[model samples]
Structures are given as structure tokens and as C-alpha cells.
Target chain A: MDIRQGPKEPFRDYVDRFYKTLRAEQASQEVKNWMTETLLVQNANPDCKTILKALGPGATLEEMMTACQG
Target chain B: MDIRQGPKEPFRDYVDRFYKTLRAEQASQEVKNWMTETLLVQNANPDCKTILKALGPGATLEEMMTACQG
Candidate 1:
């Protein structure tokens, strides 16, 4: 499944779907982790993408989502 | 920082600290994601380790944590 977050989707739902989809991919944890975190940041909507970029270096997905929601 | 969970640590605190320390590492999201998820599982106490292993094959860290706490 495409990893892009829906434009109007809530951060919680978007992140939950991101994790769920990554899990469904059934790759090695390393592969899933790489894809999950990288795509999760890259595929976010523009506003959230900006928020993610502005976050402190190495922000976790949960932290990224929290910033995106703010 | 070492990624092991303290045997006495609350799942909430352990998980939060895990993210915080990963953020401190200044590594690529991919590296941190791999280490975060892998070590997070391996370093948990026996009880939480068991819980994590028994979870759905693709359980997210949050789901593993929720199961650990149960």
C-alpha cells in the first residue's frame, strides 16, 4: 500500500495505518523499520512533512506525529 | 546510549526513554528504527520479552508495549 498520509486524515489515524501497513509487509524487522520510518516521514502531507523536517534530529515516529498534530 | 529496558522500568518510561535516546543518537531514521525496534525487543525483561514474542508477527512497538503491560 502507498504510504502517503491522507490530506485530511488525523495524525493518529495516519500513523496507525502507517505502522499497520508496515507490519503487513512482513519483511525483516530491519527492512520494515527502515521503510516504516523513512516512508512515514517522506510520505506525510506537506504540512506534516514540514513539521517533521523542523523536528529535532532523530525524532521518533510518535514525536513526529505529535508535532504534526500541533 | 544502550537500548536495554530496565527490568524494573515501567513500559511507558522504558519506551519513552528508548525514543528519547534514539533521538539523541543523530543517526539516520533507518538506523535508529532498526536499533530501536530490535533492541527494544531483545532488551526487555523476560516477561515483556515473552509478551513481545507472542504478539502478532508484525506487532508494532506500541502493541508490544500494550501487551507487555497486560
Candidate 2:
């Protein structure tokens, strides 16, 4: 995503959009807004998916950021 | 998965299998054998799924690799 300054459909939006490329229904909206603000990662790596799933659905946006290996 | 040795259920197998997450099914055996050297990248990417369908069942392994943005 375009890591520009603007949480209003800002970098967060793009990061979430891009994360969707790895898997669907897996990442929570809380996560999309969370991961993108920090870094656009190589989220597709097997390690990433494995960890992403472990986080489950209850994680807070902040919690998931570190869930997959901060 | 293992990114090493023999395409006989090699990287291609993993890549194609992984691609299923983007939207599932839709892809042919041909495509799966193509991208195992690939992404989980949210697999939910609409654009990727959209094109995957357009490819139908006739795309060569190479054709599909490019179809999903290899």
C-alpha cells in the first residue's frame, strides 16, 4: 500500500489491501490497519501464514502486529 | 513448504496449492504446477482471482504464472 501520511484511507488502507494477496478471511480489519502502518511485508512466506492463523480472530490490532513475529 | 528439489511435486506443487487460498478452485492442475514457487499474499487479492477466472482452464502453466503476476 501507499505508505503515505493519512490514516483516513491512508497507509493503513493500502497495507490491508496488499495483505489480502496472501490469504482471505484470515486477516482481520484490525490487522489490515495494524500491519500496514509499520511495514509492507513479505506476508506470503509460509512462516507468516502459519503465525497469522495462530493469532485467531480475537486479537486486537496491536496484538496481531507482534503475533506473527514483530 | 520445501522450496527445494524435484518439480515432481516440487516448488510448483506448493505454489499452485498455495494459490488456492486466493479464491480457491478456479485454477487448473496446469496452473498449480506453475506457481508453487509463489505467494500466500493474501490469496484474497481480487485482481488476481479476477484474472485467474479469465484464464479459464486452458492456460498453459506459464500462462497462469503470469496471469497471477508471477
Candidate 3:
């Protein structure tokens, strides 16, 4: 599935939704890594490499959210 | 102008292109503020309100770049 969208289902909502699924334990560690890399590599806050390095396998909703924010 | 594009001139390249123009003085502070708000609002980022508060119109090349980064 893609993470791109417009208002009523924008990119911010996409990120929040992904993390919610992660919290529910439905997402794989590999998916989290891929998502982190994809989201962070494109823009601001932190870069992909830095965020990925900080993410442990089984990274929690809170941890990964914080990771991306910084 | 829109910031949307495909792999040939993808979002990441678009952001880089903007900052480059700002550095070269081809863009105005008003334009920079609009861009910063638009880009940050749509993704895993510092958010639109925070970035705008930090961006004074005429925000320098480095300041706006760093403001959006975290």
C-alpha cells in the first residue's frame, strides 16, 4: 500500500495510521524499518540513516514516533 | 508553483531545489514561508505552526533549513 494522499486522508494522517498499526502489533519490524527509511529520507527532522540506526527491532509506537520527530 | 512530482524530479529534489534558489536570492521570504509551511505540514515533520513561528520572513537560507529539520 502507498502512503501518499490529499486532505481527508493526508500524509500526516498516513504516518499516524502506520504508527497506530505498529502499536497494535500488526506491523513487522522490517516494515517499520522500511517505513522509517522512506519517510525520513525525503524531508526534514532527522535523516533516514540516523532514525533507522536508533530504531530497535520491536520499536514501540512511542519510541518510533519520538525517533521520527527528532 | 506546485511541489509535487515523480521520480524524475521527486519531492526530495524539490525541497533541495527550493533551498538552492533561496540561497541564490531568486525567491522572496514570503515565498519561503509558504513553502516551509506546505512542506512541513504534509508529512513526518516539525509541523506547520512551529515552522512558521520560527520563520521570520527574510529568514536566512540556513535558518529556515534548520528550522524545518527539527
Q: What TM value does the first chain of each candidate achieve?
A: 0.76, 0.33, 0.36
Docking class of 1: incorrect
Residues A1-70, candidate 2, lDDT per residue (tens digit)? 2222232333345445655652442444333443432234333345444555566544554554465433
Q: What DockQ, between 0 and 1, does each candidate earn?
A: 0.03, 0.07, 0.02
Off by over 4 Å in 3: A1-70, B4-14, B17-49
lDDT of 3 by residue, A2-68 (tens): 2332334433455665466444543444434534544333332334336645675555545645655
Q: Relative to the unseen true structure, what is the C-alpha lDDT of residue A10 in candidate 1, on a scale of 0 to 100? A: 76
How much is the lDDT of residue B49 in candidate 3?
Answer: 38
Which portions of model 1 show Cα errors greater than 4 Å?
A27-29, B1-70
Spell out the clash pairs found in candidate 3. A45-B69
The all-Cα superposition gives candidate 2 an RMSD in Å to the true structure of 12.1
Better model by lDDT: candidate 2 vs candidate 3: 3
The lDDT of model 2 is 0.41
| Per-prediction TM-score | 0.44, 0.25, 0.24
Residue range B1-70, candidate 1, lDDT tens digits: 4556777777778888877866554546445455545567766877788777677445677687678773
Candidate 1 chain B: worst-modelled 10 consecutive residues by lDDT: B25-34
Error of 3 at B33 (Å): 10
lDDT of each: 0.67, 0.41, 0.44
Interface RMSD of every candidate?
A: 9.4, 10.6, 17.0
The most accurate candidate by lDDT is 1
Give the range where candidate 3 chain A is weakest over 10 consecutive residues by summed lDDT. A1-10
